[PDB]
Design a binder for these strands. Sequence first.
RNA 1: GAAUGUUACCGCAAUAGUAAUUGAACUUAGUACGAGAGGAACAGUUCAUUCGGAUAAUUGGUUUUUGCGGCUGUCUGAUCA
RNA 2: AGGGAAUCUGAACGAGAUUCCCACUGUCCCUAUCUA
Lengths: 421, 341, 73, 52, 134, 225, 116
Amino acid sequence: MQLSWKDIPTVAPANDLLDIVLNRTQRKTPTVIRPGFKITRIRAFYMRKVKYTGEGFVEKFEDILKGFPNINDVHPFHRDLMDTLYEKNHYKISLAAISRAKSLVEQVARDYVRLLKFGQSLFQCKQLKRAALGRMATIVKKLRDPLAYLEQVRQHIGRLPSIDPNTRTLLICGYPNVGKSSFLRCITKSDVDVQPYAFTTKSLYVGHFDYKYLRFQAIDTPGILMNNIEMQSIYAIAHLRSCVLYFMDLSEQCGFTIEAQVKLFHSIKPLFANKSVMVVINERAQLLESVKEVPGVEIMTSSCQLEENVMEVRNKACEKLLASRTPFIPESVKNLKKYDPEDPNRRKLARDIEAENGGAGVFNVNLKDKYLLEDDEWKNDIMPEILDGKNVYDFLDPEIAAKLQALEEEEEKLENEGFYN
Amino acid sequence: GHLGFLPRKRAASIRARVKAFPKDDRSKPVALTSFLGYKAGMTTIVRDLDRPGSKFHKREVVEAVTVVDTPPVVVVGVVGYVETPRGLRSLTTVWAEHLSDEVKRRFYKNWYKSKKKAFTKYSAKYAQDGAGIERELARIKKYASVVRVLVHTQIRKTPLAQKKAHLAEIQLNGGSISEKVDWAREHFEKTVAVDSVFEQNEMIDAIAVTKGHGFEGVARAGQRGYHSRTSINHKIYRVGKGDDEANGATSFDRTKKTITPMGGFVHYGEIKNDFIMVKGCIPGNRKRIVTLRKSLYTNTSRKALEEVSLKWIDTASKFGKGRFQTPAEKHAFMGTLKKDL
Amino acid sequence: YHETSILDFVRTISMLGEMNKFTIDENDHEWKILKKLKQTTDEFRSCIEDLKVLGKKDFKMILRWRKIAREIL
Amino acid sequence: AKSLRASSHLNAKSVKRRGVFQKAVDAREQRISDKLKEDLLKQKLEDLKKKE
Amino acid sequence: NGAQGTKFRISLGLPVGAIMNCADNSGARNLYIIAVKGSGSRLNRLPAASLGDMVMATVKKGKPELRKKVMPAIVVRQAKSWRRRDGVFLYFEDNAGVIANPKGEMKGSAITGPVGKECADLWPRVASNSGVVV
Amino acid sequence: MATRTQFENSNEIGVFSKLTNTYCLVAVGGSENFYSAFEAELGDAIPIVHTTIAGTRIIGRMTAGNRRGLLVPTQTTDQELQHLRNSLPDSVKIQRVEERLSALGNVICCNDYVALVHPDIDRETEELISDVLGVEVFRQTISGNILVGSYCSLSNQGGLVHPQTSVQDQEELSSLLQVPLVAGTVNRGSSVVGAGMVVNDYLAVTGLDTTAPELSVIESIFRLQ
Amino acid sequence: MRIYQCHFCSSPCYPGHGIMFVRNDAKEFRFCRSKCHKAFKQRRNPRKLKWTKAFRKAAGKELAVDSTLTFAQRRNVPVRYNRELVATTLKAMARIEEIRQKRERAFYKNRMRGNK
RNA sequence: GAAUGUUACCGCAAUAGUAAUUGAACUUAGUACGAGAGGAACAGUUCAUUCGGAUAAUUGGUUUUUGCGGCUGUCUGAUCA
RNA sequence: AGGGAAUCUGAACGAGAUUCCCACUGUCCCUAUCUA
């Protein structure tokens, strides 16, 4: 599948694997039969056990085979990256041994069930069942080395970083312990050691940052002097759609000659020739212009102690990577200050009200005391809403006293007339 | 079914007795622990719900409540129990010297044929400075780890055609046994009101003999119903008053009406006295005597702590269909009729 | 949910099934002629507004009425 | 799901019962016993109605 | 997934094997229920849906684009008498439901007829694609 | 001014709130953090109303309103209508509208000057929006999406439509509204842009799944900073 | 809380009584009992059936146009709650009820004349 | 249900059975932890599923109250019954 | 004056058989009540 693989079912060390599959067939299947039963129930008993152990080992083997990434079918970076970190031939030898063993176990189960429908005694049938599961055990005992390898690869691939070969990347290179660890330290949130020796870093550390509203990933590298740790860096340069930031130490530090950095830059030149290189400086000055003889290079002088030029290197890197009627506003809002969360002196929100009053789901918010009225003595509203079959809100208007008195006039205009006799 | 509710047999009496009581604190004031009435009624209430965290916070909920009729219980005795390795053991009961016609009726199965000569020699046993009564009351106060109150119901103030009141035993959860037996001494021949035992927003456990369905046919055939059931955690919504008109009036409705529906409840009369409006459905049917105990323990969740703001009481006709709250609203909507004019 | 004039219904059984509201509009001189009848009074006004509340007996109150309107045309 | 007799929930509910949850019941009890004490005086006035 | 806040009990009117109408302008006219997501389990009892419950339902009469794939369906019209907390019992004219993804996001751009109060409360994006509520 | 929040873990802000120039309307959820989300950004300047319509939390896509008025549907109880009037200042009018349709937040997309409506709305409301809100009313469709509210965010400053809107429809519709329109999204490619964010002349509140490349577009077209 | 009118009777529908019916057009048909609800289901004319109020209005057995009946309006523009403006309504509603009852009684007398 | 004087009321409790169940929703949180993608838990509160004990306020159902009404036929020489 | 359309069998058939489409129902979800 995609970038990373943490989600793999664990690999039992071939002795415990036996203790899982065989114990499960002892616990999950019926275990007690008399010799005095019918032969048909004796047959069906031991058949059920051979088959169930068959499905047992196969289930565990299938989990390994489907779980591990199909090395030559994933991605050219990952096909080669796993080839650098692990002996790719042995990685395919190990998984071939599991694929072999699963087909073996399938063959054993299919054999002994077919052989089992001809058993004449409980003893013969028992000897055949013991033969079957013992044979499966022998197959799994022959897997003590590849499964010990598969557990170690599972653990170490489970902790590998997830680089995206389709997002905007930028490799960070140079000699081991130039000061590029301080660069990624001061560009993003990733803890990389700046310990004063050669190979401090042993793998590709990743740092994410955001500029011009976009997802970037700068990949720290161990460095080039060939080793598995060293070749990891070179293949990261080769297979990633990236720009390479080769770092140089124009100082007494690093413990390596600057001329050796020149020799290494021009030697590794072919595989980063397509990548639009940036070079950052952290007779003699003339041999920096010898580095400048490369078609695509730029030279910049910076200091990691200050936080401005480290940002400016990033700016030029990202720039290289992209090319590769009136509204109504009340003055009560305009005059209002901003909400500073770490301020000792501000207004208390309802969030802090409910905490001070205790609990989230226990505090009942008073809908009253928050609405505007003429007299705040009648704030605690009762409001009848219903009187005798007819709801109050339908009768409720202003000037109902004057409207009532109009109907009072309409009383006396019918009072003296003589409708009530 | 449920194997706990076995044997699934007919109860000993309609008045089921309360099996357990709320514990005891020996610093609390003297107060009754269980009350009794007569369950008869069921009705609909709306209320706004101040239950925070819910989907119905500051919304309105309609719900079914039951009206138990509870006339003021009258104290006619006290029982003292010693703590034994065999359980409890009643050593002395004491009575009220002059008891009603109702309880002297409870002492006979055939009331009319008798000379009504129940407590004649017991009242004549009182007839002096006390001397023996105070001796038995000393006997209770000296020993007897728990003290229970003998009461009875006011059957005549209830519309029931039974005339025969029920005796009961109610323990006291007020500390110092001295104050128990002396509360009783202050309460012979006197009556106890409902709201002196309960109030609003209080959880109770109403116990009742469950509506007999007779013979019925491992899922076994036999008797269905008439079992003594205890149901716990029914919230009291309203305690009412007989003399007070506008019991059906809420903070919102405020129309002068009694919770009694038009033409009363079905198969049972009106209400002419104190009542408890309990939420949900209490076991038993109408006309059934229920005994209301209180909670056994501190049962506070937010279903027990919240305040009920009753908005409206449905007093429409349960016998038939409901269209009018008052008789006044029937002939207000109707206009005037034939026999009127 | 469909709305037409009564006059649109006149000029066309099949109409009444799909419809919900026929509308009364007094600005037309045509409706002023239809207003002055022994019909268009006694229950007929409310029958116009709520067409799916009617039933068979109130459909025939309209189907007889349409032919009265067609003879005026 | 935690049971009805789950030990941790019983202990969390005992943390509740020593706070607000009992105090409200211990105020309600005082209001009930108060009205019970009020019920003696009314009946004693109706004793003095006949004693008059 | 998708449902906002708690969900309370209303009566069950739409079992498995019930044909309801389709209400969105996606293309389908009707919907056949096959399974109800988040239901109880008795012996012999069919899974019964109600208003505002995500069911797995197939198109029977509609566009071929909406078919070939069994997809989630939220019931917006019930026609069986359920209860509201405001006193009344109510029911609609017909059974109707709207099709959506497992996240609760709508495929259609508008829902015809009334949408139930409970359904529009629980599902936010149904109320976003609602013309009529209640 | 672009705030990013949630209601009971929900990105659809416009469903659970209605925010205008003179008021903010919020649903009474268990969590008060949504109320405090606005009270942080708006303070005591414009009133934030703890409110419900028909006992539903889904207020913003049920109501209509601007600086002058407020429209609620038929299903609004007289207690909720009493409550809204009590909470609001007397400068803003309130009217319950009786219609075929009840989701007003999906039907009346408006600002302080203009309004877009559903093409099948009644004439009575068409002459009621004109009076209570005092705004120009248009029976206009946004790229065949008949509900104008959920698929168009709108202000006095500018507007935001769903990305399926045609260029011809952008020019034609912005000619009606007289504001610049940009086809954009909210909450990581959600098409519902009206309920995905609440907006006025000085604040834009989105959901916590709205990515920054979309957030820059929102800030630009509504011209905050 | 709202006490409604039955779509058939025009009788008072209390909360927790009868059934509300909603069409695909979406309007509310509240009923007070299943007598009225089944009468609606049968697709009857209410104004033909005598026991309803719709009949009694149009046939004029009861009154239709009156000054007391114009105050039971479905009212829309809300009031800011004055203690006085509610205390006035409480006595106003009890007043208008008395006058409406006396007027209806007078209408019954004016209808039942010529029988003696 | 006889018996242990009769008869009645209130009780005690040996013993026997016993029951609750699981799911997620809001704060706690977009915090801990995290290159990122993502992403918890206790305390507080809110619902629901299954199971049980109930109950009929309302809804729906139900009708030899055959309660009232309508239709068809049939008899009193016709109406009404 | 109960449908309809195919097919297997001896173009309609015949209470031939099967399958599907449409309608209907307590067969069921899930029982409830009444009468004899």
